[PDB]
Write a protein that binds this ligand. Sequence first.
Ligand SMILES: CN1c2c([nH]c(N)nc2=O)NC[C@@H]1CNc1ccc(C(=O)N[C@@H](CCC(=O)N[C@@H](CCC(=O)O)C(=O)O)C(=O)O)cc1
Ligand SMILES: Nc1nc2c(ncn2[C@@H]2O[C@H](COP(=O)(O)OP(=O)(O)OP(=O)(O)O)[C@@H](O)[C@H]2O)c(=O)[nH]1
Ligand SMILES: Nc1nc2c(ncn2[C@@H]2O[C@H](COP(=O)(O)OP(=O)(O)OP(=O)(O)O)[C@@H](O)[C@H]2O)c(=O)[nH]1
Ligand SMILES: [Mg+2]
Ligand SMILES: [Mg+2]
Length: 389
Amino acid sequence: MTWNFHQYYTNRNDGLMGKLVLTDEEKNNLKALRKIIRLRTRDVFEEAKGIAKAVKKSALTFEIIQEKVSTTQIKHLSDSEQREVAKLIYEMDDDARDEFLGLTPRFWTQGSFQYDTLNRPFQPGQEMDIDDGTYMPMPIFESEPKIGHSLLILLVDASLKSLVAENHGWKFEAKQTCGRIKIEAEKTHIDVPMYAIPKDEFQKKQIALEANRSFYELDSENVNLALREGDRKWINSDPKIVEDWFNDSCIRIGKHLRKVCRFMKAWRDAQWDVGGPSSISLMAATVNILDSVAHDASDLGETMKIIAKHLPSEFARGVESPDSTDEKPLFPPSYKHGPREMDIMSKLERLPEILSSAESADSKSEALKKINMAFGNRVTNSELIVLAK
Ligand SMILES: CN1c2c([nH]c(N)nc2=O)NC[C@@H]1CNc1ccc(C(=O)N[C@@H](CCC(=O)N[C@@H](CCC(=O)O)C(=O)O)C(=O)O)cc1
Ligand SMILES: Nc1nc2c(ncn2[C@@H]2O[C@H](COP(=O)(O)OP(=O)(O)OP(=O)(O)O)[C@@H](O)[C@H]2O)c(=O)[nH]1
Ligand SMILES: Nc1nc2c(ncn2[C@@H]2O[C@H](COP(=O)(O)OP(=O)(O)OP(=O)(O)O)[C@@H](O)[C@H]2O)c(=O)[nH]1
Ligand SMILES: [Mg+2]
Ligand SMILES: [Mg+2]
């Protein structure tokens, strides 16, 4: 016997796509959460600019500034953090202060929510992730921006911490590249990386944008990611580079690319409760395979076998980042594998065996059980599986 799994993979009700794609409850929940973070962040910046405006108009003592700070949403930072914000506002000169009073944070989501590969989480501890970047248009800087790294990080933190203080079961986490709100009971977190971008170009592009529509991309090397730990405060990491690479890959390869990428992530979620290869390494390897190996989009069962066969080789050679400015590969080459990478290799080598043995199982029932060794017990309708012609 030979079974075909195309429907097992693609059926939008019962099949794997059916199990992975967010419910509307989940999708609207994520957008509502993002809206709440965006609102609070703009409010907090307005509150801080309010104080700075006061400083400009009349010379206010440091103590008066502290007092004013302690009355705003910034009160949700620790005591020493509040004093630091007051100190930073008190201490900036006319020029920096004028820049600050002209700053309004802007937002743009990146990651799987943006390019539509966000899967419903599988094991306990696994969470849906929305990556909403905050952008701070300021003058081009070589060393350090007019408005300080410290100040900007503190305000975004205050915004996030102020929301946690208003929501049972939310908690704040600081990561190296973002601030995070975790909502365990909803299996969700929102990440907020922060970027500096050129103010003049931002304005020019926004003016162009609004004039040319009725009812754009910045210079990549000036998109600066703020880093929270380490002595390097900023790194040139433009998230649009990955978004564009993936969207262009989808165009070039076809619409089955997003599906097979979801499947590989689902495989990952089933094989490890935490850990496994990154989502981006899986996408990059999969793109490389589909660009170079003949396949048929009308049988994702066959396509998934083709991918599984070639993944070990991709990862063994090291997976290069689509961002050539990246300082490391997305996955190291095999001569540099330690325990972590060896564990990944051994699971990848297992996958094509699982898919093969499912294909040659004795019944539809046994076929389902076998293939569910790769993706977990998510699909339950064995009648999705069809005897190959
Ligand atoms: C990213 N970006 C970027 C660029 N270039 C390079 N080289 N790297 C970059 O990272 N260019 C554009 C952008 C950076 N510049 C901008 C960033 C944000 C905005 C802005 O007005 N954001 C809106 C939200 C837009 C939105 O919801 N958008 C929705 C999409 C629309 C929708 O879903 O309705 C969303 O977040 O999903 C806001 O702040 O309220 C305007 C410009
Ligand atoms: N240049 C570069 N950007 C990265 C890297 N890892 C993550 N990013 C950026 O961060 C965004 C989100 O990354 P992840 O959350 O790991 O990946 P995801 O595609 O959202 O996957 P899931 O959250 O697992 O669904 C990506 O779209 C990239 O913009 C990396 O190694 N190099
Ligand atoms: N621009 C840019 N953004 C990134 C990059 N890496 C991560 N991000 C963003 O910051 C978020 C958190 O990044 P990470 O520190 O990689 O998160 P993580 O290590 O996967 O999470 P844990 O495994 O729980 O520590 C991501 O989801 C992205 O939104 C990067 O290289 N460039
Ligand atoms: Mg993500
Ligand atoms: Mg994230």
